[PDB]
Design a protein around this ligand. Structure first.
Ligand SMILES: C[C@H](CCC(=O)O)[C@H]1CC[C@H]2[C@@H]3[C@H](O)C[C@@H]4C[C@H](O)CC[C@]4(C)[C@H]3C[C@H](O)[C@]12C
Ligand SMILES: C[C@H](CCC(=O)O)[C@H]1CC[C@H]2[C@@H]3[C@H](O)C[C@@H]4C[C@H](O)CC[C@]4(C)[C@H]3C[C@H](O)[C@]12C
Ligand SMILES: C[C@H](CCC(=O)O)[C@H]1CC[C@H]2[C@@H]3[C@H](O)C[C@@H]4C[C@H](O)CC[C@]4(C)[C@H]3C[C@H](O)[C@]12C
Ligand SMILES: C[C@H](CCC(=O)O)[C@H]1CC[C@H]2[C@@H]3[C@H](O)C[C@@H]4C[C@H](O)CC[C@]4(C)[C@H]3C[C@H](O)[C@]12C
Ligand SMILES: C[C@H](CCC(=O)O)[C@H]1CC[C@H]2[C@@H]3[C@H](O)C[C@@H]4C[C@H](O)CC[C@]4(C)[C@H]3C[C@H](O)[C@]12C
Ligand SMILES: C[C@H](CCC(=O)O)[C@H]1CC[C@H]2[C@@H]3[C@H](O)C[C@@H]4C[C@H](O)CC[C@]4(C)[C@H]3C[C@H](O)[C@]12C
Ligand code: FES
Ligand code: FES
Ligand SMILES: [Cl-]
Ligand SMILES: [Cl-]
Lengths: 359, 359
């Protein structure tokens, strides 16, 4: 039978080959939500051209491009197989990838979903903890697509806009941490300090109200509860760029500081993403675990495996979607409150897009 | 066998009368691990004299003094009654109050516990979420006391150094929120937005690794889970002073921003305090809920009652102490990890004090 229920998996994406780097950067610098540059239509291509060599070099250091699409595909296949059994009344299910800055783009995916004549479309963010710069930006693209195509949707929409504490996500993280603790020397296991690391935000974004640091903090505590507080931890933040203030502590400074303080056995845990990413394979694994850690005289630094193709994580995706369908909800209660100092007029329009849907 | 088990309830304290304000400020400004001032022994008394009138005026606005001691005493009495029945082998139990910056001082309470000839002494912080500037300052005073008096303790020490997700604490907050949502006009209940508000930290402290923002985030999520996400929330931060950057968003800016954006029905929840305090009775209730809120045309702003004399909260305190005794733990696993960028040599000494205790 023709597909009945579309699951739109949303992610920023990354360039699949070196050749895709420039236009990934160009689409990003053009995104008026993410940044207000003067004369932005002229500055965006110039900044993309300037930054491209450096970013292509990073992807070169990890094998030539981003693995996000492979992993997103494998997890979406697994999720659809389960949902056809779990939810016969909404089957067949089909997953679609909507990347914000590379192909397939969010707008290309919506065009195909409509072409396919689905009865309902679920905007399923692949970021478990909500930031306006991540999930909000992917949801804004859905609202803006219909606003700009000048037609109403032909499908019933709803969103799973966050899931920072789903019990099977927490189980996957706990399982990968225990697997990685087993690979330290046994005599150092109990000395291991865990740094959960997540992409940082600028403080201008924290201070306007972004939900993300409190949600990532929640994910951390539920993982440590499941692990029975077996090792001590901190939550720290990676990927800061530029001269402005961002939320710290920084993951690089924290690795170096712990080493300087005699804690030389460290487990990194990428707590805000669901697959490997340049953040993990370059920044944590090369910049921090090889170079920085070597300079400071670490004894053992390891990183928990990304969730990637763990079948339990496909089972989480499916249970999220199945609960969402049975609840009839259109979005979380949290999406109905925009940031207290939000200055972007589209956030309200996108919230209303979802809360106002027929059903 | 006389009192056998002393429970030292630690809090920073506040001045009980207007006459106690100057010496509260003086002790604060002499505390070199909270602040390093040029020519500190001369400047501290001067800044204490200069800022006393303004701080006396805040306390005069709430009736002439801090209620922390009355509430802590009532909670401590309730806790002891329960502990004598829960734990006959460690009875009789006696509570002592140790305030960091007013009488009875931490040092005074230790002197009495040792005078009393207790077998066992439990350093029980009354902050559920740990900051190095709150619970860590109290624990450093216990270590420094023995280091100064140059005698070893005569009782067996251990600490309950944090408890941000204790199930009965969570139940108390959820109960107080729901009863406050009952006081709104029924036609706005669904519209109410919850701002959990906790004392902020300077970014310099957050960026060195202080555990506090992630633990307060955890308390917020456990409370919202218990409430089944009935209303939307943000966690925001109050009490910033001075011109340096602190963690935001600010509670005051957030209340003004929500009003300006049409969310004019707000419930404030002091999520990091267990009793009323100048930050609730003056800052939230007068500066924000009366002056700020009237000025931007709020419709309804309420604040959940502080835990104060709720008997389920004395139940929580006793359950924490009974579980701690049964577990034989000397401190949390998290106290065994100092901040990654800690620069105070005493933190390691105080950690060792607790982890090394006989028993
Ligand atoms: C002023 C502005 C800040 C935008 C903001 O307020 O966030 C910043 C952001 C990106 C900056 C530009 C980009 O970093 C690229 C250029 C970098 C050069 O070193 C200065 C000019 C240059 C063209 C920058 C000018 C200016 O400082 C920009 C435009
Ligand atoms: C790729 C580009 C340059 C950074 C680098 O050298 O890696 C970086 C700089 C700042 C980044 C943006 C900032 O990190 C702010 C955003 C934070 C979100 O968690 C990711 C998207 C987000 C919108 C970022 C995407 C992208 O990777 C950016 C634009
Ligand atoms: C790193 C890059 C400049 C590269 C260059 O031309 O040298 C610039 C271009 C635009 C910048 C972004 C924009 O200024 C908007 C954001 C401004 C916030 O103040 C910090 C992050 C923030 C997301 C910026 C981070 C970073 O400095 C960016 C991504
Ligand atoms: C007294 C002074 C002025 C604040 C005011 O207007 O109330 C403030 C500035 C920073 C404050 C301190 C910092 O907030 C750090 C601590 C926070 C704890 O909640 C109380 C003690 C604590 C050590 C504070 C005591 C006092 O309220 C201080 C020292
Ligand atoms: C420079 C120093 C900051 C030390 C720190 O970073 O902790 C600050 C903190 C408190 C300040 C002092 C207090 O604010 C009291 C005085 C206030 C007057 O405006 C200037 C002199 C005055 C005597 C200050 C001098 C100086 O600016 C001090 C001493
Ligand atoms: C506000 C107060 C007095 C100002 C005055 O002279 O009237 C000053 C004097 C000493 C200051 C403190 C010290 O500078 C040390 C802390 C350093 C952080 O950068 C801010 C908070 C911090 C705790 C300061 C907050 C506040 O501005 C204090 C408490
Ligand atoms: S920036 Fe967060 S809702 Fe608009
Ligand atoms: S400042 Fe946090 S452990 Fe020393
Ligand atoms: Cl990537
Ligand atoms: Cl007080």
């Amino acid at each position: 039978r023709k597909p009945k229920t579309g699951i739109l998996m949303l992610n920023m994406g990354g360039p699949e080959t070196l050749g895709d780097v420039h236009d990934f950067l160009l689409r990003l610098f053009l995104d008026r939500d993410l940044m207000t540059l003067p004369i932005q239509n002229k500055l965006a291509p110039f900044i993309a051209k300037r930054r491209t060599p450096k970013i292509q070099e990073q992807y070169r250091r990890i094998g030539g491009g981003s693995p996000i699409k492979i992993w997103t595909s494998k997890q979406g296949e697994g999720m659809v197989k389960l949902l056809d059994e779990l939810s016969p009344n909404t089957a067949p299910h089909k997953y679609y990838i909507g990347f914000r800055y590379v192909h397939p783009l969010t707008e290309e995916a919506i065009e195909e979903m409509e072409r396919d004549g689905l009865e309902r479309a679920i905007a399923f963010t692949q970021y478990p903890q909500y930031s306006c710069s991540t999930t909000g930006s992917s949801l804004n693209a859905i609202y803006r697509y219909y606003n700009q195509v000048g037609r109403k949707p032909t499908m019933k929409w709803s969103t799973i806009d966050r899931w920072p504490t789903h019990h099977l996500l927490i189980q996957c993280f706990a399982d990968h941490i225990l697997k990685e603790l087993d690979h330290f020397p046994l005599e150092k296991r109990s000395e291991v300090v865990i740094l959960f690391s997540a992409h940082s935000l600028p403080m201008s974004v924290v201070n306007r109200g972004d939900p993300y640091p409190q949600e990532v903090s929640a994910t951390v505590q539920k993982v440590m509860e499941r692990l029975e507080y077996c090792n001590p931890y901190r939550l720290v933040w990676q990927s800061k760029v530029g001269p402005m203030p961002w939320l710290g502590p920084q993951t690089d400074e924290s690795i170096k500081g712990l080493c300087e303080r005699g804690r030389k056995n460290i487990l990194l845990v990428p707590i805000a993403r669901t697959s490997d990413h340049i953040e993990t394979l370059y920044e944590l694994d090369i910049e921090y675990s090889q170079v920085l850690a070597k300079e400071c005289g670490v004894e053992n630094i390891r990183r928990a495996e990304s969730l990637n193709g763990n079948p339990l994580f496909s089972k989480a995706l499916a249970d999220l979607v199945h609960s969402h369908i049975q609840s009839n909800e259109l979005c979380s209660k949290q999406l109905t409150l925009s940031c207290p100092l939000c200055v972007n007029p589209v956030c309200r329009e996108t919230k209303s897009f979802f809360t106002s849907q027929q059903l």
